[PDB]
């Protein structure tokens, strides 16, 4: 479950028994507006819009209202920020988490490609710490994907921002005197000019100390929920949901089928193509290629580590079954899309993987097996003459152990999402 430092955190905002409340010892009151969306699959995931009633207000207990020259403190949360697509967002800093009142306190704000921490004393001495990310990038680790934010403040030296458990930047704050923050914390888009802007946020916490790097890394690992497979955006991977595939070893290709049946094969076709709005973004197109759909071989539709599965593939508006004849000498087993009623004694059961038995994570998601739990190999690809055919290979399985590096079997499942819109190609 949650770490001890979470259980003893001074504000621990979580969904419990049908409501969002504070789990901390302080049990601060939470007021939720009428246009807040809670993800039905994972109600800890909170969506806040550019609308007046889309807000959450925390009424802090007096004991933890920040008023000090010396008390260290930190905040952590995950956020998912939709791609910026309007030029109106270019030079528009908007607050999202506000504890700044009467010229002192702290706030989290966003801007085009930015997450910003602002801290200010009662003399209005101010410091800012920023995380920048680009929208001019082939495949982004940050745009529209869940990222873990941690901000720590040591009153004697620095404020630091971490992203995904890793230090990004730090700025001195030792010149700041008494900081007297707000009695409340307002989660709300404030001053955003993009009327369609929203954020997703989850797992907000406040701590009354400077978290160290080990604690932050541990929080990151714990809150990642690694026993559950994730889609590209970082949401839970689901059964019966169409995903566009992205191979991390060769991102500039998409999955296609030359012909259906055992005489045909699955391969990576290129180029993937780009999407662009001048001065705003330039990225690889994500919504390309033949969709995979994950099929049950628990009633909640969430795909978990070690779940046995079938993979369906959508070709020309019809579903087929990923399968292969593994009885031949070659270690690489070429994958084909079969008519589902015609799969027969072909190998088709896949074990979904997020991590190994020792807890080590790996992006290699699909280990094809026979029907008795015996490995055929992780699904990746292999060049045959000029053609990068989809392949299952035990060579991958041997590589997973020795090294943590990206391999041909490393995949991402990308569902269509409101935070990433593409014009049609």
């Amino acid at each position: 479950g949650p770490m001890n430092i979470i259980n003893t955190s001074i504000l621990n905002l979580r969904y419990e028994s049908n409501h969002l409340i504070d789990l901390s010892r302080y049990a601060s009151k939470i007021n939720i507006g009428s246009k807040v969306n809670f993800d039905p699959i994972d109600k800890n995931q909170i969506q806040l819009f550019n609308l007046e009633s889309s807000k959450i207000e925390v009424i802090l207990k007096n004991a933890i209202v920040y008023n000090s020259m010396y008390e260290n403190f930190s905040t952590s949360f995950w956020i998912r920020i939709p791609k910026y697509f309007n030029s109106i967002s270019l030079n528009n800093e908007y607050t999202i988490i506000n504890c700044m009142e009467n010229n002192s306190g702290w706030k989290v704000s966003l801007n085009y490609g930015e997450i910003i921490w602002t801290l200010q004393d009662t003399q209005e001495i101010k410091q800012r710490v920023v995380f920048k990310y680009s929208q001019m990038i082939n495949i982004s680790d940050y745009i529209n994907r869940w990222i873990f934010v941690t901000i720590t403040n040591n009153r004697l030296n620095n404020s630091k921002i971490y992203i995904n458990g890793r230090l990004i930047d730090q700025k001195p704050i030792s010149n700041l005197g008494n900081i007297h923050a707000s009695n409340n914390i307002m989660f709300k888009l404030d001053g955003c000019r993009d009327t369609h802007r929203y954020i997703w946020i989850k797992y907000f916490n406040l701590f009354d100390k400077e978290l160290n790097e080990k604690e932050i890394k541990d929080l990151y690992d714990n809150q990642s929920n690694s026993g559950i497979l994730k889609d590209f955006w970082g949401d839970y991977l689901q059964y019966d949901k169409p995903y566009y595939m992205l191979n991390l070893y060769d991102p500039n290709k998409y999955v296609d089928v030359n012909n259906v049946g055992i005489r045909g094969y699955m391969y990576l076709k290129g180029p993937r193509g780009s999407v662009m709005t001048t001065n705003i973004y330039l990225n690889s197109s994500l919504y390309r290629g033949a969709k995979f759909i994950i099929k049950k071989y628990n009633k909640d539709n969430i795909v978990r580590n070690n779940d046995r599965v079938y993979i369906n593939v959508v070709v020309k508006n019809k579903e087929y079954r990923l399968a292969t004849n593994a009885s031949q000498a070659g270690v690489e087993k070429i994958l084909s899309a079969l008519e589902i009623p015609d799969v027969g004694n072909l190998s088709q059961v896949v074990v979904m993987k997020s991590k190994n038995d020792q807890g080590i994570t790996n992006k290699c998601k699909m280990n094809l097996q026979d029907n008795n739990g015996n490995d055929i190999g992780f699904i990746g690809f292999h060049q045959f003459n000029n053609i990068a055919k989809l392949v299952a290979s035990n060579w991958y399985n041997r590589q997973i152990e020795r090294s943590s590096r990206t391999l041909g079997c490393s995949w991402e499942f990308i569902p269509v999402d409101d935070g990433w819109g593409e014009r049609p190609l």
């Epitope: 246009k35 969306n37 969506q47 819009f49 609308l51 889309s54 369609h196 169409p242 919504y287 969709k291 759909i293 369906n312 959508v314 508006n317 019809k318 579903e319 269509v416 409101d418 819109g421 593409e422 049609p424």
Partner: nanobody, 118 residues
């Protein structure tokens, strides 16, 4: 063999109204209409699609957002059983002239011209 087909655009006078409609057909059972967001975009006259504006969005959550200039004038809606989406456009202005597009999930209509004559 799947398509979004749009209708209901064309010419109108300032202060007048139109209603755009959009229908999703041919989609296999893998496609769940209810799970998809319906959007209406418009392309400003004289500009490329890079200048497309999001006019209105209706996601599965039901929390609708509008372009600022159309707030109070345009209303978006959807019919999940009919697989349809609608854009009710009232009190039109010359600056509403544009090619309008229906977008459902990753799928797009071809575009429908709306022209407001001063």
């Amino acid at each position: 063999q799947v398509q979004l087909v749009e209708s209901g655009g064309g010419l109108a006078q300032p202060g007048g109204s139109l209603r755009l409609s959009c229908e999703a057909s041919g989609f296999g059972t893998w496609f769940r209409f209810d799970e998809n967001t319906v959007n209406w975009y418009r392309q400003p006259p004289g500009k490329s699609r890079e200048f497309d504006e999001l006019v209105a969005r209706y996601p599965k959550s039901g929390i609708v957002t509008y372009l600022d200039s159309v707030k109070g004038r345009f209303t978006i809606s959807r019919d999940n059983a009919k697989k349809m989406a609608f854009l009710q456009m009232d009190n039109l202005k010359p600056e509403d002239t544009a090619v309008y597009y229906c977008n459902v999930g990753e799928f797009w209509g071809q575009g429908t011209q709306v022209t407001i004559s001063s």
